[PDB]
C-alpha cells in the first residue's frame, strides 16, 4: 500500500463532473474544479485542467494525469510550508502518507490550522493526537474517511485500509 492506492480509495474515480461532499464540483479522483456554483465555471475549468474541449467527461488516463499532479502539488506544499514540513519530516513514511491525504483533502491551509495535533505529533504522541485530531468539523464531517487517517496517525500501519 502507498499513498496512490490510500487516496484512490479514500476519494474513487469518476469520469464525469461530480459534485464533492461539501457540494463542488470535482472530477476524477477527488480533483477540485471550483468552489463556485456554476456548471459552465466548472466545465471550464476542466478543459483549461485538460487541454481540450472536454464536455465535462474525461478519460481514466487523464483522470490519473491529473491525480499525479495533485499528489505532487501537495507533497510540495508540504515542504514549503514552515508548520507542516517539520512535522513530516520528523515522521516515518506511513504517517507521512497520512499527512499528505490531509493535505489533499483540506488544503494547507486547513491542515496548518490544526497546531496542536501537529505538534503532538511531533512528539509522538499517537493517542493524544488521535483524540485531538478527532475533535473537529473534518472529522464530523467525514467520519469514516478521518476515522481511516486518524488509526493510520496512531498505529503507522495499514491497517485501516485493509
Ligand atoms: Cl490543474
Ligand atoms: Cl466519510
Same mark, same amino acid.
Given at each position: 500500500m502507498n499513498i496512490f492506492e490510500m487516496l484512490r480509495i479514500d476519494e474513487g474515480l469518476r469520469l464525469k463532473i461530480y459534485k464533492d461532499t461539501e457540494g463542488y464540483y470535482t472530477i476524477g479522483i477527488?480533483?477540485?474544479?471550483? $468552489? *463556485?456554483? *456554476?456548471?459552465?465555471?466548472? $466545465? *471550464?475549468?476542466?478543459? $483549461?485542467?485538460?487541454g481540450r474541449n472536454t464536455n465535462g467527461v474525461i478519460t481514466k488516463d487523464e483522470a490519473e494525469k491529473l491525480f499525479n499532479q495533485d499528489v505532487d502539488a501537495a507533497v510540495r506544499g508540504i515542504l514549503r510550508n514552515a508548520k507542516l514540513k517539520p512535522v513530516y519530516d520528523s515522521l516515518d513514511a506511513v504517517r507521512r502518507a497520512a499527512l499528505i491525504n490531509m493535505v489533499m483533502q483540506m488544503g494547507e491551509t486547513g491542515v496548518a490550522g490544526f497546531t496542536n495535533s501537529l505538534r503532538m505529533l511531533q512528539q509522538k504522541r499517537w493517542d493524544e493526537a488521535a483524540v485531538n485530531l478527532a475533535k473537529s468539523r473534518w472529522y464530523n464531517q467525514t467520519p469514516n474517511r478521518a476515522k481511516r487517517v486518524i488509526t493510520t496517525f496512531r498505529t503507522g500501519t495499514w491497517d485501516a485500509y485493509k
Open positions: 477527488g480533483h477540485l474544479l471550483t $468552489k *463556485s456554483p *456554476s456548471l459552465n465555471a466548472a $466545465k *471550464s475549468e476542466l478543459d $483549461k485542467a485538460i
